Symmetry: C3
Subunit: 183 residues, 3 copies
Amino acid sequence: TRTLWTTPDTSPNCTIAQDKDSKLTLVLTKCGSQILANVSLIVVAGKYHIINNKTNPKIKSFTIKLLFNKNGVLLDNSNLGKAYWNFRSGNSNVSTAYEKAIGFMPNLVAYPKPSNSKKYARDIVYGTIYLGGKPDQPAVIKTTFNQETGCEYSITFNFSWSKTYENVEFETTSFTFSYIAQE
Amino acid sequence: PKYDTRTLWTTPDTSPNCTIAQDKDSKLTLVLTKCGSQILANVSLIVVAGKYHIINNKTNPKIKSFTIKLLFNKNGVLLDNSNLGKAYWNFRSGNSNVSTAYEKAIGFMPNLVAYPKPSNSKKYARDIVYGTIYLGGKPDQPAVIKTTFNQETGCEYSITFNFSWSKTYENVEFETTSFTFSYIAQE
Amino acid sequence: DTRTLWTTPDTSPNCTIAQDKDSKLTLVLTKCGSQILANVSLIVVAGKYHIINNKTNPKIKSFTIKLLFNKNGVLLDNSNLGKAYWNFRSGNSNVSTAYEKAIGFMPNLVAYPKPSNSKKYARDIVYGTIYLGGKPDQPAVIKTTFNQETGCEYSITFNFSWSKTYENVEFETTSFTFSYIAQE
Ligand SMILES: CC(=O)N[C@H]1[C@H]([C@H](O)[C@H](O)CO)O[C@@](OCCCn2cc(CN(Cc3cn(CCCO[C@]4(C(=O)O)C[C@H](O)[C@@H](NC(C)=O)[C@H]([C@H](O)[C@H](O)CO)O4)nn3)Cc3cn(CCCO[C@]4(C(=O)O)C[C@H](O)[C@@H](NC(C)=O)[C@H]([C@H](O)[C@H](O)CO)O4)nn3)nn2)(C(=O)O)C[C@@H]1O
Ligand SMILES: [Zn+2]
Ligand SMILES: [Zn+2]
Ligand SMILES: [Zn+2]
C-alpha cells in the first residue's frame, strides 16, 4: 500500500513511438505529504532506440505521459501500459488491479490544471540523466504535474537532449525527485 | 482529527507569505516531510512584486542574488525576523494547516552535530546543498538555489535559501521550478 | 522498517581511500518503504586526495569509495568505510549491538543486478554534483553505482571525479541526496 510501481524488471511496458518499445521503471513511494519518486528509461526498439542525430537532426525529444482518473487509476491513453502498474508485492505486483490511489496523485492546489489564470513553474521538476551511464551523454528529464487534458491528474516525462548523438542507445541512469501529494 | 504531524509546510497555495525586499513580495512554497531521521524537503519560489520580481541585468547589472532566511528557536518554532511569515508555517491539515500555532518541531530541525553553528572549529561544506531551478520553467533560465543549515546567528537552528544567477536576464520573472533535497534531522 | 542506517554525523575519520582513515564519509540511509532515501558527503582529511593540485598533478582526477555487503546486508571488512561506526542510529550515535540484518536497506537485485553476462543497464547508476568547500565554482561529480562489485551480495560505490584544474583545493564537499530501490 506504500509503493506504486512498474516492477523493476526489463520487460517492455511502455509505448513511445511503437507498441512496447520501452521499459519505464518508475517507483512512487508515499512518504506522507510527499511522494518520493525514482525513474529511469530503457528504450528497446523503434525510433528512439538508437539515436543518430546525423541521420535524423530533429529527433531531439519525446514524451511519456501517465494520465490518471479521479481515483488515481491509470488511463489507457497513457504511454505506460495498465497491466504493468500497481502496488508492490515483493519484487512483483499484486495480481489484482488497484481501485484507489488518490494519495499518490500530484496535489491539484500545488499543481493546478491549465486554466486562464497565471501558470506557475513549480509544477515542473528538471533533472539530467545520462545515456548508457556515460558522463558525456546527458539528456534532460523534465517532469510536469497535472498539465494534461483528458484526466484528473498527470505526470509527464519529457526527455530531450542538445548534443548531436551518433548511434547512442537510449537507456538511462536513474533520477530521484519528489512532489506534493493530493492527500 | 486529520492533523498531519509528519509534515511542516507553508501550504501549497500561491498566497504571498515571504518578505525578500518588501512586505509579502513572494510565496515560498516549502514542504518538510519527516522520514524518520531525515527530512525530505521540496521548495519553490514565486516572486510577485518588488525588486526581485522582474529581473533585468541590462538595467540593473548588480541585482544577481538574494537570500531567504528561516530562523528557529530551541523548540523548532519560527522566529519573527525570518523572511517567511509565521502565520501560515505550520503542520499540515489537508491543503491547509492545523488550527493553532505549533509549539514543538525539534524533529524537523537540521542536526546540529552534522551542521554546527559557526565556531572556532573547522567549518565544513556538508551543511550546504546546491540545486539548480529554472525561471518560468524555461530550460535556458537556470538559477542556483544554495541551501545552508545552521549558519545564522541569533537562533538555535536555521535554514537559508540563497538564490542567484550568472546570466544576464532581461525582463525574466523570478518564479521557479521545484527542487527536492533532504537533510539530517536533530532527532 | 522506518529506521536509519548511518555513519554517525560527527567528523571523525571513518574511511580509507588512499591511506588509513584519511576521510570521513558521512552517509545516511533512511528506509522509506520500497525506497531508501540516501544523503552523502565527504571530507578528506589527509593523504593523496586531501589537497588537489591539477597544475602539479593533472592526472589526479578521480577516486572511489566502496561499500560491500554480504547476504544479510552487513558491511564487509574490506570496504573503504570502516565497520566500527556503520550501524543503526541511536540519538546522534549508534545502537550498541552491531546489526545482524539490514536486507531492507540493500539495493534491489532485480533493479540492479550483480555483474553478469547479461546486458549492463545504466539504471544502477545515479549521477550528482557536489561542491568543494561549498564554493559554487568548484564542482565535482559523485557517481553512485549499485551492486556492481564482486566478492559481496550487495554494493554501493561512490566515484568522485572532477574535470576542472583545481589548484590546492581541499576535498571536502557539500551534501547530495538520492534514492534507490530497496531489496525488501
Ligand atoms: C556527470 C556529469 O556531470 N556530466 C557532465 C559532463 C562531465 O562533466 C564531463 O563530460 C566530464 O569530463 O560535462 C558535460 O559538459 C561538458 C561539455 C564541454 N563544455 C564546453 C563548455 C564551454 N562552455 C562555455 C564555458 C562555460 N564554462 C564554465 C561554466 C562555469 O560553470 C560552473 C562553474 O563555475 O564551474 C558550473 C557549476 O556547476 C555552477 N555552480 C552551481 C552551484 O550551479 C557554477 C555557477 O553557476 C557559476 O560559477 C556562478 O557564476 O558554474 N567554461 N566554458 C559552453 C557553455 C555554454 N553554456 C551555457 C549554455 C549551456 O547551458 C544551459 C543553459 O541554457 O544555460 C544550462 C542549463 O542548466 C541547461 N538546462 C537544463 C534544463 O538542464 C541548458 C539546456 O541543456 C540547454 O539550454 C538546451 O535546452 O543549458 N555553458 N557552457 N563548457 N563545457 C558534457 O556534456 O560532457 C555536461 C554533463 O552534464
Ligand atoms: Zn539495440
Ligand atoms: Zn509576476
Ligand atoms: Zn583539510
